[PDB]
With several copies, the nearest count.
Chain A
Amino acid sequence: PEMLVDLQYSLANSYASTPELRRTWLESMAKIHARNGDLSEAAMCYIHIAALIAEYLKRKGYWMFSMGWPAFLSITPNIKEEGAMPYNENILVEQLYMCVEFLWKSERYELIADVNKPIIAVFEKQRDFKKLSDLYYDIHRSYLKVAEVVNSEKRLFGRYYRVAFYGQGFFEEEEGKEYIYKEPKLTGLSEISQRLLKLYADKFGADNVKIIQDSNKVNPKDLDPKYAYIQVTYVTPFFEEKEIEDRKTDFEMHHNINRFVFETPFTLSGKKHGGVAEQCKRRTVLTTSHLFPYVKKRIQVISQSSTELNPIEVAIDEMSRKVSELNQLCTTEEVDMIRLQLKLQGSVSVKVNAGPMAYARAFLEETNAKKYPDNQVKLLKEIFRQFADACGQALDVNERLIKEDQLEYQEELRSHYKDMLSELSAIMNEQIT
């Protein structure tokens, strides 16, 4: 029970002590990780052990990893932790093999060449050519795998969640701390929140632990002192446009990440939900203390910032997102018909929700236009144009895919789209395709 406090307990133990305890405890953390399935945190453990041994050996004057821990800086910048404090070279390598075994089991294949690079150099010096060839073949199989699965739906690296604990005389170490929890991937909010509640409730008693579903910043003054609280919120990794440029692959999107983001709805009326003219949205970027992957699967959030989006900014955003997603769905080589029809019908024929023309009416009308900042309406006018574009492009795409038991569905999608054009015009007074 509570494998998460166990890791942190062992980890807190690996400081204020000797090199060998630090090692001993990282190894222990690793066997907990392994058996809990957090295979990347077992690999990050072995790689920290490795850099520990390297650093200790360098400092003892025993001599690539003769550099120190910087040898491993490209696996992860967390490794700089090892720079503060009867080993030998064959032990160092054996730890690096543990790492490689677990990069393999954690499907973070792209690091196998880098963790192997120093080992090759040890075996260059001893002219052990057969072991060199094994090392090279291994790296080869490693990129073979990467080539097989990279940038596809096969590899599942994790789903991330903010978790924050609040209860004065309940939590003891995590009290007031806010964390990011890296969960085995495709883990749902339902799974993690219910798992946390059952853990801490076995700790404090059945109905003394409350889930906080609101995602606003918790002020403790408003907390019923009679309970322990756990705020749980889905977050995804956050990147600036520059960063999004610099990371090509899915693995690259999950490697060395310390920033996460989540969106909270609210209305200027101070409520949580409302119509498109007053419903706003806040975007909050949490920053951890250490990048993922790390030797533990939860990392404290040390800082935070947020920005707020206008009703019209909420619309500029979601329409841009919608144009892109439909374009993208129509560039693809072998277009998935059901997903196509799903997103198309959900744009041109909505019957449960307001519809794109709700934004068109609220923000693009001449009177309501006077209300909002001008160049923002101009932006949304263009975006709405491009939107009609992508909708027509998809409506044509799908006509090819039809198996003729869906014709009348397709006329009706088309006819609804033509009405949507008519209205969009009368709001903007343009020919609109």
Chain B
Amino acid sequence: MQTIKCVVVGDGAVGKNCLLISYTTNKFPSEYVPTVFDNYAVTVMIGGEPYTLGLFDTAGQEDYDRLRPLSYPQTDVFLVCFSVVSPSSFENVKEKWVPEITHHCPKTPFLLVGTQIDLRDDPSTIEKLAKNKQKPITPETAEKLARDLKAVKYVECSALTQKGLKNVFDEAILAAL
């Protein structure tokens, strides 16, 4: 087994940690057994070949900005995430994360990963979102940004309804060679 170092970056209350615990422990978010350690090591099969994808998780608040530079080297691929039902988090991909990671390791590829797609339809979310006068993000405008930001692909997924979950990680590990 050859090991891949993948790294995940983006906001914190967006629920990317949720997506990740969901995929590496095979569990619905409700049933995750919490751990006091970070980073998750998952075994994935692609093109008929098993590899162990190591995931280095980084939370997103500005305080940690200085220590995070240290875990970047030899990363085969990055995963840069937003939430479709959090517009303010869509912007932060343009204004915070993509320029950062691009500035450190320009040539290393990445994805834009839309999360909480189950929520985009729900009436409660979209109405209380319209109170604040914002609409949820369509994969149209997000793939507009994929084809805008030198993004390898825009992929989306739901940790709650289990939709598109496998696809994100397959697309990562394959874009790492």
Contacts and interface: CB of A to CB of B under 8 A. Distances in A.
Direct A–B contact present (CB less than 8 angstroms): yes
Interface of A: 152-154, 156, 159, 185-186, 188-191, 193-194, 213-215, 233-234, 263-265, 272-273, 276, 279, 281, 314, 318, 322, 336-339, 341-343, 345-347, 349-356, 358-359, 403, 405-406, 408-409, 412
Interface string B38-66: 11010111000010101011110000100
14 contacts: A153-B43, A153-B50, A189-B26, A194-B162, A234-B27, A276-B36, A322-B37, A337-B3, A339-B3, A349-B67, A350-B38, A353-B36, A354-B36, A358-B36
A189 B45 contact: no
Contact of B31 (A265, A318, A359, A409): A265
Interface stretch (B68-76, B88-96, B128-136, B141-149): B68-76
B84 to A, nearest CB: 18
A349 B38 CA distance: 8
Given A153-B43, A156-B50, A185-B45, A350 B37 contact: yes
Given A190-B162, A406-B74, A234 B26 contact: yes
A366 to B, nearest CB: 21
B28 interface: yes
A336 B3 contact: yes
B162 A405 contact: no
Contacts of A343: 37, 39, 41
A403 B73 CA distance: 10
Interface string B132-170: 000000000000000000000000000000110110000
Contacts of B41: 339, 342-343
B30 A353 contact: no
B26 A213 contact: no
Nearest to A351: B59
B44 A186 contact: yes
Contact of B50 (A186, A190, A194, A322): A186
B37 A281 contact: no
Contacts of B33: 263, 265, 281, 314
A214 B30 contact: yes
B50 A356 contact: no
B36 A351 contact: no
B40 to A, nearest CB: 8
A114 B136 CA distance: 61
Contact of A214 (B31, B32, B73): B31
Nearest to B33: A265
A333 to B, nearest CB: 10
Nearest to B25: A234
A272 B165 contact: no
Contacts of A355: 36-37
A339 B54 contact: yes
A190 B43 CA distance: 15
A279 B35 CA distance: 10
B73 A353 contact: no
B54 A345 contact: no
A31 to B, nearest CB: 24
B98 interface: no
Contact of B166 (A188, A234, A346): A188
